[PDB]
Amino acid sequence: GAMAPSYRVKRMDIAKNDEECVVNAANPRGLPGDGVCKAVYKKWPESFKNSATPVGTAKTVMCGTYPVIHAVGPNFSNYTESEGDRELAAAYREVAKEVTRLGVNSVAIPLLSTGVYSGGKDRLTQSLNHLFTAMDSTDADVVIYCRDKEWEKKISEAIQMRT
Template structure:
């Protein structure tokens, strides 16, 4: 899908192994600590320096984002976002969209040309995948005209089901 000057794609893969992008999004916890899922994978790949850099930036609230160096990751930056817990953090869609908008703005502000993101909040935070894909792609489409540097947003999905849902949503928008 192309929006303004921005290409948007979905691939299956490991968010911690995206060497050709400038920045990756970490689906973080409020304290920006290593954990399970995406946060665990990113922190393991980045090494202990990432947690050290994150410490003074925490805590963050749902919908917020902060940016750090990428340390041992093959990227320049990591954008840490705290997605909403579905059914608890309200309004969920607004908070989830804020994660993506802020991630795009932070990466763009640092001169990044490309950004890779997982499907934020769809794991343990319980956000329904179909709805999360719509919110994510709406947020990217809304923010795209304001971006000065970003030219590629890649959604990196861990499972075939996640990939299929995002590809279907991208296809629907390209018709």
């Protein structure tokens, strides 16, 4: 475990992370995709061997000894708000199980279903609160990665609120 488990947020490419493992915002078919998924494919392409997994699940594949946890959030274009909310919570619970199983002291994590799977809605708070619900019982240092300046401020505020 980390000596004093923390949450932090950084605004940069998750492919440049300083953590012991990464969570990919994956598609169910293990395809290169767009956004975070494409960045992850360029940095760790070996981790896409047999990475396909259903919505609401996570599947870990090693790139050398570096673990890539492929977490499949729902595409809100296809799911109802209710069913998508259930699958988004479930994907993060599976990430917490994998982080624990791996024995890592730190993890880099993007906000699932906030980009091209958002169905055109702002899901920062929804996605971040499901992240916290899953990760709060883990003792890894969590570093959340985002690209938008206003999102960085809002994520930082939400972390600092609960300290």
